[PDB]
Design a protein around this ligand. Structure first.
Ligand SMILES: NC(=O)c1ccc[n+]([C@@H]2O[C@H](COP(=O)([O-])OP(=O)(O)OC[C@H]3O[C@@H](n4cnc5c(N)ncnc54)[C@H](OP(=O)(O)O)[C@@H]3O)[C@@H](O)[C@H]2O)c1
Ligand SMILES: NC(=O)c1ccc[n+]([C@@H]2O[C@H](COP(=O)([O-])OP(=O)(O)OC[C@H]3O[C@@H](n4cnc5c(N)ncnc54)[C@H](OP(=O)(O)O)[C@@H]3O)[C@@H](O)[C@H]2O)c1
Ligand SMILES: NC(=O)c1ccc[n+]([C@@H]2O[C@H](COP(=O)([O-])OP(=O)(O)OC[C@H]3O[C@@H](n4cnc5c(N)ncnc54)[C@H](OP(=O)(O)O)[C@@H]3O)[C@@H](O)[C@H]2O)c1
Ligand SMILES: NC(=O)c1ccc[n+]([C@@H]2O[C@H](COP(=O)([O-])OP(=O)(O)OC[C@H]3O[C@@H](n4cnc5c(N)ncnc54)[C@H](OP(=O)(O)O)[C@@H]3O)[C@@H](O)[C@H]2O)c1
Ligand code: NA
Ligand code: NA
Lengths: 265, 266, 266, 266
């Protein structure tokens, strides 16, 4: 198995000084990814972020992390739907930064229909990115964690992995996120001698990812969220740092719902 | 909008499948979940279509046993659930041969034999393609038929591996795929809320032959973890399949039923 | 040491309750889960004991319908599940009158009508005492009998309120009690692993008369939240009670079955 | 009308409890969840009220340590959570002494030592009274205060016993009580949606001294069932208490966090 933190103080437990964190899908301006990276940078991590289509957005984010926190930071192209791209990512980050201590598997894409209206290829694309893309990052980084004897993998899942969203149909997305949640549990057991694995399941977060949804659908959502509002990505940074850091050295195979209370109903 | 309650008051009338057609994928083995679901449905009066992949002879013998024992019409079809074209063809053939499909039991599946670090990417892909995308292919192929008819019941064989992580054998690709299958039933129950019910059954360790690739000493460790202290038998699951497939469950949709001898209570 | 699989192969033999005795608490109303469970079990050939608290007459009417319709031995007993002495007396009287108890359906229950801040401490205690401790009283009372006989099946009526928080009415005491009932079934399934099975059924909104104190605008809002779009009917639940009480489920223990028209899928 | 997101952008500012007051029940022991939660909150700048039942001297030493180590105001109170009057008096006294309560950590609890057949009804009532109703008593007492102020965070120490049945020791009363606490957090998260967050933490086996009565050879069977292969330490949980108590979790409500070395993954 794995050992308890040697730190007594919580600020020592939360510190990421001397550690390297990778955040996939942190190229946008206010997503879960850039906020997780900001939290880790604030705790002193060196941070590697990835992009797929938004190179300029990721380069801007890296310059912001450098300006605000003075950390070692860098952006990488990664298509998580390709295992070869995830393998190269881990190879390049280990080369450039020396090691990877925590890996935040955060990249994902949305669905826009149920299974009968959607084509088989539309199902394949969402499963390839959201489910197999997360498996590709886990396998690629897990080989590194096994050689080092330590590591933390944090998977961004979704409350859609627990419930079926309404009124928009998106079963392919719901199913892939469900697989991600159980992947965290199953890898926590597989990797029990060398690494922790946990998942965070956000509710409706105002990141821009849902901008393709009509306005009037989004006001229905609000009546279903007990808190009555969308979340903000900066309300999730504490959870990412919690799982990536030594504040959670007995936490493995857990899922943390962050959803304004949506799943309580 | 929505679905209606059974008209039947008697439970025996509710459970009857006389006049109805049931498809069971992966029912070619002699003592698997598939043939026992098919037996239970045929006993209630269903016409039954079963599928095989590699066990063509076992499927023909099962069909003959179903017909002679229960007096029903049955037929076996070759189907590779990992191919949508094969699943679409199955639904078309059964609807042509039998006239309709009232219940579909998505039961075909294959096992994993390693965790993700020891396994290749292709070994992962194979298990997900069969167990997760194969269930999706069958769900989509038959759901177009259910939507046209305005009724239907889809029953998915998941696994307790979709809830917990097996020990000591590593099989994460199988665990993840089955977990996807469980939530697929919940999400499709909501998607199809106007015309069909969808539910899953999550068996524990069932003595079907599927686990024969695992040493017997590892199977002795499983028994100490099962509160009932034994493997199940496929004949102990037939009532759940018939429950979901019939009118005994017209308000049950999006449910999962663990049949694991208590394994998940610890 | 653990429990054994059913001897029967055919589903109708597994489902039969000929020669067995079923107790259903709280089956005094004309269309509740309780009387429909008793009808399902009686249809399968069981002798049936039902209980009442305030509705002695309705329980008597039900015994007479059960006997006329199904030709079985039936009898009504007064029982206050909130009193352990009364549950102990129930099991003692039924065993004296019927010879034994094979299946026990712990179904009696009462609602709450506020959250914890608007409610008094007495209001909390009353709901917990009836719904949680009353289920415990029956389980303990009959469990001593199951342990002596080496066999048995306990079926607990929980609620989807044990999984989610109902909206817009506040009823946290009832939610909490029902969540305890659900986990009581998992925990007793493990505790009683050598001699009896325990499972729960979690109904959604069922048109039994129990929510007749709820206004109409509120009930129409519920329907928009139910994917099936309608209240359930108690006759749609009899199949689940019989499944768990009979030998159709000899590998099923520690399971919960949501019967909620899809409500908890969202 | 709902609750709002933190105004802070920096995580350190979000975690800060400067100017806030935290109550931690049952923090009188030397290495329990309570004193580590209290140390975590003191480290972030909170004023801290801790309670004791039997260990008055242990609580006073803890208060002297908190004030010496962290330079904060701290105070010990006697509280019997099984008595509503005591919990109501606790909130009144802390509000009078400190001015307000911003976060309340409902952590006091007691263990069970048998299953329901070996245990008496008294033994069941005692555990439920302390572990379920004691938590309700604190929730009700502080929630009246949270409602008045329009802000607050309630953190409930539940247990993985609220999710699974421990083996080999039988403790169904405790398991059931902890399952009530877990759902109580979800249900109050919704009831209190306009003014306060409610969340639970479910520890696995933590080396606090609470399990010192368990035979040592039973404890090493536990370790074989924990993927991490060891007991936890209370200092590994202080991060989670501070997370829920502070502004680092202003969109997190109705959540449960398992901290169990992976025990429930199997
Ligand atoms: N927003 C919500 O309400 C919500 C709720 C629950 C869960 N989530 C999940 O949170 C995670 C982050 O999403 P977000 O809301 O923060 O919006 P976002 O800022 O747009 O993040 C999406 C990230 O995923 C990357 N991405 C998409 N496809 C990729 C692929 N094939 N390969 C590699 N990277 C890919 C994107 O990169 P590029 O932009 O460079 O192409 C982008 O950086 C996702 O997994 C999402 O499913 C979001
Ligand atoms: N046995 C257990 O302990 C257990 C526990 C939990 C869940 N399950 C699941 O229960 C279901 C039935 O398995 P079983 O235990 O009853 O053993 P089984 O008799 O061998 O059934 C598996 C069926 O799946 C078919 N199959 C495999 N791959 C297929 C593919 N690509 N396309 C179409 N069909 C394919 C097989 O057909 P052919 O033989 O003709 O090739 C076979 O009939 C499976 O989904 C399994 O994951 C089993
Ligand atoms: N209807 C729903 O929507 C719904 C949903 C989920 C769960 N449930 C649960 O289903 C179960 C049956 O309720 P129902 O809907 O079928 O309505 P019901 O017909 O009124 O059944 C309630 C039964 O419980 C008995 N009862 C109440 N308090 C009792 C006590 N202290 N001791 C002994 N018996 C007591 C009642 O006896 P008397 O009438 O003779 O006094 C009555 O027969 C209950 O546990 C309920 O919580 C109902
Ligand atoms: N240790 C574990 O493995 C574990 C696992 C899961 C959950 N938990 C839960 O964690 C919480 C704290 O326990 P712990 O492990 O940290 O051991 P602990 O140090 O002995 O804490 C138990 C605390 O609860 C107080 N207490 C007991 N009965 C009380 C009552 N009727 N009223 C008020 N206070 C009462 C005790 O006060 P006095 O000592 O002053 O009498 C004590 O301070 C408990 O709820 C426990 O159920 C523990
Ligand atoms: Na829900
Ligand atoms: Na478990």
């Amino acid at each position: 198995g794995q050992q308890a933190t040697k730190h007594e103080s919580l600020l020592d437990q939360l510190s990421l000084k001397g550690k390297v964190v990778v955040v996939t899908g942190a190229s946008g301006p206010k997503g879960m990814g850039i906020e997780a990276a900001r939290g880790c940078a604030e705790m002193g991590a060196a941070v590697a972020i990835t992009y797929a289509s938004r190179a300029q957005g990721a380069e801007e984010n890296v310059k912001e992390l450098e300006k605000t926190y003075g950390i070692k930071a860098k952006a990488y192209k990664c298509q998580v739907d390709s295992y070869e791209s995830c393998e190269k990512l881990v190879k390049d980050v280990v080369a450039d930064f020396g090691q990877i201590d925590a890996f935040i598997a955060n990249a994902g894409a949305t669905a826009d229909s149920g299974i009968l209206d959607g084509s088989v290829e539309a199902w394949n694309h969402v499963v390839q990115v959201d489910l197999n893309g997360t498996f590709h990052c886990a396998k690629a980084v897990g080989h590194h964690f096994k050689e080092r004897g330590t590591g933390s993998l944090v998977i961004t899942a979704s409350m859609s992995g627990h419930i079926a969203n309404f009124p928009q149909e998106q079963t392919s997305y719901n199913v892939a996120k469900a697989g991600c949640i159980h992947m965290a549990r199953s890898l926590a057991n597989e990797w029990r001698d060398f690494a922790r694995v946990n998942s965070i399941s956000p509710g409706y977060i105002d990141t821009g990812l849902s901008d393709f949804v009509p306005k009037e659908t989004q006001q229905l959502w609000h009546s279903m969220i007990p808190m009555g509002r969308d979340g903000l990505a900066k309300e999730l940074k504490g959870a990412y740092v919690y799982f990536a850091s030594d504040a959670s050295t007995y936490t493995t195979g857990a899922d943390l719902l962050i959803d304004g209370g949506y799943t309580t109903r």
